Symmetry: D2
Subunit: 455 residues, 4 copies
């Protein structure tokens, strides 16, 4: 049911291993805000699955072969090639990370007042659309928004909302379709291949462009392989290449499924767009030949993209998350379902039924997980949603979650046990989890630096 | 006169060593544009001094100590504390490179229609200023536009122009003063400490903010020590700290004087502006704790900044460039003078008086240098100025130069000899340099991919 | 019971993951000798615990700081000072590995015809002793030769035998006492602190020198802490230091408990012997300042020794082996007991009672394990004992075992499960294990290259 | 005349750069013995050309791909292959360094009382022959012993002394011919290919075996290419492979021409010898599959051996030494001639004509070179030759030299200038160099730790 690691450990990253009593002082010193803890004081850092991947020995042999020419670097050539071969986009511009590609895609493909429609959104992506004049429309299935509904391919687009958007608004005024795989906001839910093929035939008919937010495309490809009829004899690399055939381009963040600690890229097939991309790339990132990346990082991303296609790697990655989700669900701990490709989201509202959302249950639960286990998790509730500065009132988000985001090839099943066991013991005396009040609240970006105290 | 390397070679980058006949083929495949040459086919790459520095064995040991947490990394802490110590600014936000810092500073510091005044500009910096509504005003002394005039501290601001701008336009309508150390357009020329003090006193009086474009600020420090009376007992580290004491903040590309291959940072002292910066940095670069850089890169840049302060390193850096210029001057080759900190600029109109500027003398020279020595240099003339799209006619630039830009710690004095020697023998037969016609010209960013043939 | 890894995965070694049918081909190409298998074709290599440790990110940062001077290296100084501190010996001469230390100690400490007495032997150590004229005398307690007897501190010396040797042969005719921690032939069994004190007092009385074979001395430390009354408040670092206080010097293979891939060292307190050692080390290993090791390796071994002292590391190391043994014991698989610090030994005569020891049961089992799981283990039986060349007949060894040796910090608990699970299902059909005949047998070192077929 | 480096610097090793006054305290603290100085306090360490080579970026990418299996490692396979392909020996056993191979060759190929004859000797090699019963006979040309005679191929064997040795002693009692390339003792002098072909036909006729001491075989191959008629159209790899065709095997030290910091090997074509080598390899070095080397070191040696065949690399290496020799000879500084492949030997007896050999001129000159330049050199005179412990009298060596041994790819021509210039300034006031007296003299290995004072 749960595979052993399809790799050996080559090098370890040592941890201090501080006791509960010292962890509580550390948590207090951070103001009960896990964003303020130091990296050194944390055993298992599940804050994000972004850029904290463990690289292979081959990736580190790439790291010493960094040809750092400004232009003409063999690292750029090898990255271009790999992405062309694997994803099949004609052109490819390297960027420092996913949000660097996003910035470029939104400046090049949006006319003010056009609509951008996708399957739910991701913060940096919506920002760049919106800052360029687009109106974002969510055309995800309604079922994606029910956080307990256990259905498959929950990130698919409603073709029926897709159609009415074109009828009602006009294909002309639709900038592009932003299809994301997986759907982060629904908890890392996969998009079926049928869904992607349907979306491309509808949009093609009406002349509409489709651009993929492909940050976790390889976790998506595993779901298709695991769960869609017809892909049982297909390889992950075949599924990934078919996926990108229903798209005109994509913004990718290597920090997610590329198994690197930095790097992203923009791909497109349009030669015209590509020439415009090239001029805009030099102001924001660096020349078209390196895009704000050191050569050794283009190489390591190249080797990573290829390493991610190994079935055994992506199966264990995804099933290592599911392991954690299964163990929590088995004990009755409330989570978002079905468990996604990269994280387990605890539902803090249900976990902490005694607390109201003003007493910051997700934030407080996330503080407690650190003290009990030495595991850092991230608040994804009311604190992260911010205050409405018109009214002054918090924005009250429907989802009041603590996210357990798993970096790739860093932790073992024993580390998941540590996590699961602490959360289970906490669930068993859930009523004893206190509420938090701010003792310090920033104007902007409050989740980052807010500090709190117990009520 | 000319110091020996104050280091030893730890590891080499192997090179091909292809012969003249093979290089001529390579330059032909490239369409005689040196920007299209492959990095593998080049022996000594002087395209740029950006990001191609050789790191130390301690930087590389820091490379293996990357703490890649999203937040709380030991490498962000070591970076932050190193800049605060060395440069003296209160806050520091890391960015993937210099232009990411510039984007951020210009969104935070300019109201549309205000004036931003500096000592000559750099492309990216001027773009970010103007893109945010600023009108750019060049207040460098008149003597820095004279490419042949050999005076010291050619980068200094004319205070007389700085006064008239305040008079004429008013200090409320001045966004900030953009002081660059050193000045790249004038050939990498230094700014005196007196000049920096003078500017801080005049702008202070009028409430005007002063932000440095500090990318080559340690090369500048060296000229201050070598040439300004009074700084003969001060250390490079004291010179740097004093310099930044006259600025409100700075944008910095670590790729230039921090001796790394990627990385930059915005600094400022204003708390209010720092908070605005943190919300904006998330969208463009990454969380404010990493700013688009892997942990290992924050580490290496921290260790780099600190190595850059060693007298003997910087003294050998600047004197190695000087050596190349000295050898060229002594054979009668025309160069920008006086020699800067980072590059030698050949004067290609002089070098090639038989050719008109429509016959693309600098590009042709840069093609000929590669063919004869295996060295790549950058065209900096009519080809890189671009055409006027309303007229259609070339922007015919006053300076028609070939830039020999020297990466820190990569080449030896024998390498300077290969360059010098080839450039001297071409000078001896300068009349045999043919002109070039376009055989393919791109709508935008023409210098990057234009290809040519001989007339 | 079973601790989680007290570290995180920094970098992985990618593995093939070939299927059963392909492994069977591979095992056949190997002639069913697991020593001929390729390292690429192996998933989990338990051939040996020697030199295949995963290093830390600090060891690797030390790897980039190799000062490779012939003499005066900072890495020799950091090594020397770390051993002096941790182990407490006055002098320390680095050697390329444990047996280089042994060669040196035996040339310096034995007069031909003297007796050298220890607690069971190890091949290399016994070779170097005997090659220098020594007669080897086993003074381990009688209970350690009983492979099934589960007592603690099975490595302890019988003082009664140590007394008779002194009586019978005289202390002048005793070269030195060779005390091994832990005892590899008995299955990696520990030596109590009491036993080490007892020996030091008896040998001291008689003027007899005591040199440790300390290769797994930190695994031993752990058993002392876990099991000897009185050492419950002492640290691994205090246990180690106290242990070496009962020895005159030690030969050490860093490949085993210093967590490195190469390196060893001889220690002693005698100045006279140190001077003789320095002249002899030059001929066999290198100058006394490097002893056959690159500077980077002296560095990593210094950093390794110091990491080996962390309670949680060593406690997880020893408990990971125990875990594997526990799972095997619980299904009724016969193993040497009690489980050692570094390996589990299967009892293959038991496991395979249908086969005679001429039918090569251990080798056959080791072939079958690889086929069924992808794990390599070592034959330790009749095949590795060799033949008698006067008789021609096999040396028929009392112990007929398959050793599952676990490298430090490389595999997880899921990896232990793969092994355990395969070994348990073979045990369930133990009668189907065929015997092997030689199809090629070498004159010497037969186990290394012998090949077989099935009967 | 002197080529530029055929490489770029990838990483630097920082140096402290301490002034003459502090260097003199450092020299005093070392007892005027350069063997006692620390590596950190030295600018340019010319103590030895052994193991202090700078590796390439490809070699360091090998360093991260170390497959550390005990047996079956892909690194072992790649080393075996490279050596088989390049040198052409049938079998090859890895050893920790050159003296590990020597130890094995001498145990396997000498019967007590047999003669070993070679072209002069090297310490560790003669030791291992002599310790195994051989009588060494020097059959080098007489001209090699005249240290000022500038002739080519000074390391050739006298075929006429070769013949009389067989006549007078009997081919039967000649163990093997030890042919070394280059000849270290004559100052790194080359052996012609004709000489090697002649030696093989003579020895073959009488059934006598020939084993190469090939530590600097690649510097030898350059001389043949530079100076022997007929090899102008041959490549270095062709010259090296022909060289080894006149040999039955060889001991190699990778630390010399293999461009690594550790590693050696033994090669032979005899299958019988090879089986005996295998059993003896496990006691002294480690299994036949790794020979006392970590996997990453076998890989790096593999890539190094191949990198050394680049003509441009070996030409610049050798001509970088010659540069130093030419500059010293031009000023009249007395050296051994002709300058060898790896070092310049100063003749301290002539340099210091005012001092008698009891006042230790070479030692004192070597102390002065450090104080004036920060360059460490090695005494190779009376101090290194030792005392005769029968008489108690120093052994008075004919050659009283200070050796300037150049590591490969570490220093530039500017570093050689630093060296040359300091030695020239010292020569100009040569009479002011004082004599030394011991204040501390070790029984064994005196050169290593003797300390002195000025008379
Ligand atoms: O960990 C992640 O979610 C990716 C990075 C990320 C974190 C926070 C935020 O507001 C936007 C992006
Ligand atoms: O630097 C060298 O000469 C190689 C090593 C070496 C040094 C000294 C010695 O006595 C024997 C060998
Ligand atoms: Cs990261
Ligand atoms: Cs770069
Ligand atoms: Cs090893
Ligand atoms: Cs070395």
């Amino acid at each position: 049911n749960y595979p052993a690691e399809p790799f050996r450990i080559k090098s370890v990253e040592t941890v201090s291993m501080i006791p509960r009593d010292e962890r509580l002082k550390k948590m207090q010193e951070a103001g009960y805000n896990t964003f303020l803890l130091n990296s050194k004081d944390i055993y298992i850092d599940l804050l994000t699955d972004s850029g904290t991947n463990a690289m292979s020995d081959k990736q580190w042999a790439g790291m010493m072969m960094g040809d750092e020419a400004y232009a003409g670097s063999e690292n750029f050539y090898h990255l271009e090639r790999t992405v062309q071969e694997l994803f099949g986009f004609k052109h490819i511009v390297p960027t420092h990370q996913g949000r660097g590609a996003e910035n470029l895609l939104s400046q090049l493909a949006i006319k003010p007042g056009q609509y951008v429609a996708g399957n739910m959104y991701f913060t940096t992506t919506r920002y760049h659309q919106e800052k360029n004049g687009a109106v974002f429309v969510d055309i995800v299935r309604d079922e994606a928004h029910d956080a307990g509904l256990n259905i498959a391919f929950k990130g698919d687009i409603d073709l029926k909302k897709l159609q009415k958007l074109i009828d009602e608004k006009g294909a002309e005024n639709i900038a592009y379709i932003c299809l994301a795989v997986t759907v982060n906001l629904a908890g890392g839910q996969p998009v079926s291949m049928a869904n992607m093929r349907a979306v491309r035939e509808l949009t093609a008919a009406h002349g509409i462009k489709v651009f993929y937010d492909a940050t976790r495309c390889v976790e998506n490809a595993y779901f298709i392989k695991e769960q869609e009829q017809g892909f049982e004899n297909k390889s992950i690399a075949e599924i990934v290449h078919e996926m990108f055939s229903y798209a005109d381009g994509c913004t990718m963040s290597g920090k997610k499924d590329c198994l690197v600690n930095i790097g992203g890229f923009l791909c497109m097939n349009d030669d015209e767009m590509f020439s415009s991309a090239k001029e805009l790339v030099v102001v924001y990132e660096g020349m078209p030949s390196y895009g704000g990346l050191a050569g050794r990082d283009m190489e390591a991303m190249a080797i990573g993209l290829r390493e991610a296609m190994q079935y055994e790697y992506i199966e264990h990655r995804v099933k290592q998350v599911r392991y954690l989700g299964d163990k929590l669900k088995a004990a009755g701990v409330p989570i978002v379902e079905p468990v996604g490709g990269h994280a387990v989201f605890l539902d803090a509202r249900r976990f902490c039924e005694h607390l109201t959302q003003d007493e910051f249950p997700a934030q407080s639960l996330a503080a407690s997980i650190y003290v009990e286990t030495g595991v850092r998790s991230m608040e994804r509730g009311i604190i992260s949603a911010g205050r409405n500065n018109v009214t002054g009132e918090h924005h009250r988000p429907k989802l009041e979650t603590v996210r357990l985001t798993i970096p790739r090839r860093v932790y073992t099943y024993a580390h998941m046990d540590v996590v699961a066991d602490g959360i289970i013991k906490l669930y068993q005396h859930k009523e004893d989890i206190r509420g938090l009040k701010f003792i310090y609240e920033p104007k902007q970006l409050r989740f980052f630096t807010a500090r709190f105290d117990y009520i």
